[PDB]
Ligand binder design. Structure first.
Ligand code: GNP
Length: 409
């Protein structure tokens, strides 16, 4: 009465990375006139293979009156301060050095202005980086750190509403020495800290504003019963609440939510994307099956039967073009998909081709138009990666993998 193992069968050679780009994220550093906002920036760029020492060293000093970096799964465009002009991560940078820290909380202090500046830009999950933990006046003191967090914590809730148990991530770092920015500080220097580096965190946290604000989208992953009807799934976009009306596509059926449960069967009032929920719903669910998608009544997830997509073949068939029949799995979908009116090829530098491939096979990729006999929810991988990431199985055994590039009428 369920479904396991989605596109976790993407367990394939690591040329997944090629077609399947990294995730684009917009991050912005809000800081003081002395925070280390720039040195931290510059340090991340060098530390992350983006730029050399001499370049980094430039930026460090050109702080006197679009860049980006990478991480295993994300590319982080850097925005400024005073759609993809709206940030997904707001990192307030504070200095722990005695004097500077305390300074910003007083009168000339922009710390209150910055907190408000965050709220001004839709940061409802502020990452706070407490910089300068190497400083002689800091020495990585567990108390000086824990003194700053508290102070900031009380503060932020007051001046800008940030509740620090669920709206702000605190993390000690050293932009100058690079300690805790890429690799978690080694226990030698600081024994107490137990979390991840700054980039570790940034490379995996779910709360990305753009995504948290997008229309709700949770691919149904299980039909199993309980009090009544349940529906597990990793929310991929937006948020879901209590007593919230939700759509089921492609069956355009409205349906009200009644209770949310997490990975500890404990009733939570809400949940965002990235979470792995176990929603419980109420209504005519006489047509609700795994592979379908829960979504926003106003801006629902798309669902078509014709669409473009870049495919890449695997095993050893030789099968040709316009009429290949296999299994698609995009999210938790599982639907019939017939190769139709093809278009191009691909070669090394994600090229293309001028001649519509005769066929495809063992060692080849292509941007073909596929048709399904019945609608299936999907989005441009470019827009909602998961929701546009499929694989093709044939009579029991895997054969290809693709990302849907364009959705057709
Ligand atoms: N001890 C120590 N000093 C630091 C550290 N980072 C920066 N500083 C000092 O603080 C000064 C100001 O840093 P800076 O990053 O330029 O501040 P900013 O005003 O936030 N930069 P910008 O305005 O360009 O974003 C630098 O001249 C440097 O000497 C650090 O990690 N440790």
């Amino acid at each position: 009465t369920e479904d396991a193992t989605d596109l976790q069968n993407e367990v394939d050679q690591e040329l997944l990375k090629d077609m399947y780009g990294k995730e684009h994220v917009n991050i912005v550093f809000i800081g003081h006139v002395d925070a280390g906002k720039s040195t931290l920036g510059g340090n991340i760029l060098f530390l992350t293979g983006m730029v050399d020492k001499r370049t980094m060293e430039k930026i460090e000093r050109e702080a006197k009156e679009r860049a980006y970096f990478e991480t295993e799964h994300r590319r982080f465009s850097l925005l400024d301060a005073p759609g993809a002009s709206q940030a997904d991560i707001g990192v307030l940078v504070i200095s722990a050095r005695r004097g500077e820290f305390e300074a910003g909380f007083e009168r000339g202090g922009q710390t209150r202005e910055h907190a408000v500046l965050a709220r001004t830009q839709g940061i409802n999950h502020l990452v706070v980086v407490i910089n300068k933990m190497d400083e002689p006046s800091v020495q990585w003191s567990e108390e000086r750190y824990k003194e700053c967090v508290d102070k900031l914590s009380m503060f932020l809730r007051r001046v800008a509403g940030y509740n620090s148990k669920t709206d702000v991530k605190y993390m000690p770092v050293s932009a100058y020495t690079g300690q805790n920015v890429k690799d978690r500080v080694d226990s030698s220097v600081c024994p107490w800290y137990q979390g991840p580096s700054l980039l570790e965190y940034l490379d995996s946290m779910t709360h990305l504003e753009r995504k948290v604000n997008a229309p709700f989208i949770m691919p149904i992953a299980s039909k199993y019963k309980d009090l009544g009807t349940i529906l597990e799934g990793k929310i991929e976009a937006g948020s879901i609440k209590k007593n919230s009306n939700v759509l089921v596509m492609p069956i355009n059926q409205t349906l009200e939510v009644t209770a949310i449960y997490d990975e500890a069967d404990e009733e939570i009032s809400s949940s965002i994307c990235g979470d792995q929920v176990r929603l419980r719903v109420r209504g005519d669910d006489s047509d609700v099956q795994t592979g379908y998608v829960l979504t926003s009544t106003k801006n629902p997830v798309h669902a078509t039967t014709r669409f473009i997509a870049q495919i890449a073949i695997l095993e050893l068939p030789s099968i040709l073009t316009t009429g290949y029949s296999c299994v698609m799995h995009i999210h938790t979908a599982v639907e019939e998909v017939s190769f139709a009116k093809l278009l191009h090829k691909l070669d090394k530098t994600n090229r293309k081709s001028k001649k519509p491939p005769m066929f495809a096979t063992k060692g080849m990729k292509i941007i073909a138009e596929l048709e399904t006999q019945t609608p299936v929810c999907m989005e441009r991988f470019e827009d909602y990666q998961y929701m546009g990431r499929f694989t093709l199985r044939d009579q029991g055994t895997t054969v290809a993998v693709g990302k849907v590039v364009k959705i057709l009428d």
